[PDB]
From a paper:
The genomes of most C. perfringens strains contain three separate genes encoding highly conserved GH33 CAZymes targeting sialic acid glycosidic linkages: the nonsecreted 43 kDa NanH, and the two secreted 77 kDa NanI and 129 kDa NanJ. Here, we present the structural and biochemical characterization of the GH33 catalytic domains of the three sialidases of C. perfringens and probe their substrate specificity. We report the X-ray crystal structures of these domains in complex with relevant sialic acid variants revealing the molecular basis of how each catalytic domain accommodates different sialic acids.
NanJ is highly multimodular comprising a central GH33 domain flanked on the N terminus by family 32 and 40 CBMs and on the C-terminal side by an unknown domain, X82 cohesin, and fibronectin type III-like domains. The structures of NanHGH33 and NanJGH33 display the characteristic 6-bladed β-propeller fold seen in exo-acting sialidase GH33 domains. The inserted domain is not present in NanHGH33 and the RMSD of NanHGH33 with the other two structures is 1.7 Å. The inserted domain is not within the proximity of the catalytic site of the sialidases, and therefore likely does not directly impact the activity of the sialidase. In contrast, these loops are relatively minimal in NanIGH33 and NanJGH33, creating a somewhat shallow sialic acid binding site. This lack of a +1 binding site in either NanIGH33 or NanJGH33 supports a general absence of selectivity for α-2,3- or α-2,6- linkages. However, NanI is predicted to be fully secreted while NanJ has a cohesin module that participates in the formation of CAZyme complexes and an FN3 domain that is postulated to mediate attachment to the bacterial cell-surface.
Numbering used by the authors: 358 to 803
Write the structure that this text describes.
Amino acid sequence: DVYKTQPVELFYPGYLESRGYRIPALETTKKGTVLASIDVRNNGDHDAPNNNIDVGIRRKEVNGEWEEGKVILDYPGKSAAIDTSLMSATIEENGIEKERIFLIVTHFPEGYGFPNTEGGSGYKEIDGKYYFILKDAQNNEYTVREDGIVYNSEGNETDYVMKNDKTLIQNGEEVGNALLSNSPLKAVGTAHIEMIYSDDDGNTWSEPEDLNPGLKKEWMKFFGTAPGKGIQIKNGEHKGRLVFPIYYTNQNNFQSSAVIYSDDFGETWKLGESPIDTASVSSETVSSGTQLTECQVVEMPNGQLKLFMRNTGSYTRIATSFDGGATWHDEVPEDTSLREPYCQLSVINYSGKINGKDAIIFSNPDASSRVNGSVKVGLINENGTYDNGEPRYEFDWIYNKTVKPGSFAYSCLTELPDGNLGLFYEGEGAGRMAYTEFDLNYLKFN
Ligand SMILES: [Ca+2]
Ligand SMILES: [Ca+2]
C-alpha cells in the first residue's frame, strides 16, 4: 503493498503571520501540478466577520516538493475572502488545448458575514446595466457608474469617485475604502462570489471579478462558494460547461444548494435551480424542512450531474440533473452509506476504471460528529430508468477506509497524475491543514 504518505502540514498557526487556517481546496492541473488553496484566517479560525481572511495557495509540481505558500487575494482591512473552490478547465484555441485554472471565493465587506448578511445583489440595475451600490451613514443609496463616478439617489452626480478596488476619492483626496467600516460611503453588507483565474499553472492570478451582478437574486441574503472544487463537463451536449457548486439563503434564512455555470469559459454565468426547487417548493420562499447547504458535484458517463450535499439530515443528500446543472430531478434521496454530521464533504470523479466500472471518490467525517475521516470508493452502476426514461445511475460503495481516526472536518480530494489520490483536510488541530497521498490499495486493505 500500500502507498500512504505521512500527513504533512501545508499551513499551520504562525505560517505567513496567520493565526488561523481553514477550508481546504485541492485541484490537479493538466500539467500534473497539485494546487492547494486555503483561507488565510489571519485573526484566527473563526468565520467572518471580524477576520482579515485572505486566499492562500501552495503548489506541488510533478516530481517536485511543496512550494512555500503565498497570498493571492487580499481585501482591505477585515473584509473577508472566505471559502475557495478551484477548477482546472480547458478550451480548444487554434488546435491546442489551453488551460485556465478558475477559483471562486465568497467575499464580505468589513463587519459582515453569514450570521448578519444583508440581502440583495449589491447592485442597482439601471436600464439593463448593473451599478455597485454604496450607502451612507444615513442609509441613502448611491451608485457607481461609468468612470467610477458616484451618483446619489436623485440620479445626480456627486464629488465622489470609487476605484475598482473600492477606494473612495472626494475632490482628488482619498476619503476611505467602501469595503471598510469607517468609510463615508459603504458597499452593501452582503455576500458576493468573486472569481480569479490563472493561465500559468497557478503561479499568478487575475484581479478579482465580482460574479453577483446579473447572477445573485435580490431576495438572496447569503450567496457563497461551496468550498472545494468545481468541474468542467466532459460528456453530452453541455461538454465544456464550467460548473461551480454554491449555496445561498432566502429571506427566511433557509439554505439551498445550487450550481452556477458558464458556457463561454467563465465570461458569463447563470444560476441553476436548487434541488430545493420542486413542483411544490420554491427555494425563494421555503421556510422549513431539510436545508441543503455546502455541496460538491460529479459527472456521470453520459454527462448527467450528481450533486452531493451537506444538509440538516443524518445522511448525505444526492440530487440529479439531466440538463447540466440548470434544474434537478424533484426526488432528492439520502444515501444511507454516507452519514453526514453537518460538515463539508468532497466527492470527485476518478479517471480510471475500477473493477471494470467508472467510479467516484468521496471523503467526509463518517460519524455523528466531525471525527473518523473516511475515504470511500463508489462504483457507478446503470440500473434501468426514471419516469422520464432517463438513465438511472447508482453507487456501489465498495471501499470505506478510515484515513483520520480522530478529529476530521472539511476536506478535499484530488487525483494525482499517476492515478494516486491526494487529500487536503482539517483535523490535526486549530489552524493545522494536512495533506496526504495514497493509492487505491490503501483504501481496500483495512
Ligand atoms: Ca485582507
Ligand atoms: Ca447532516
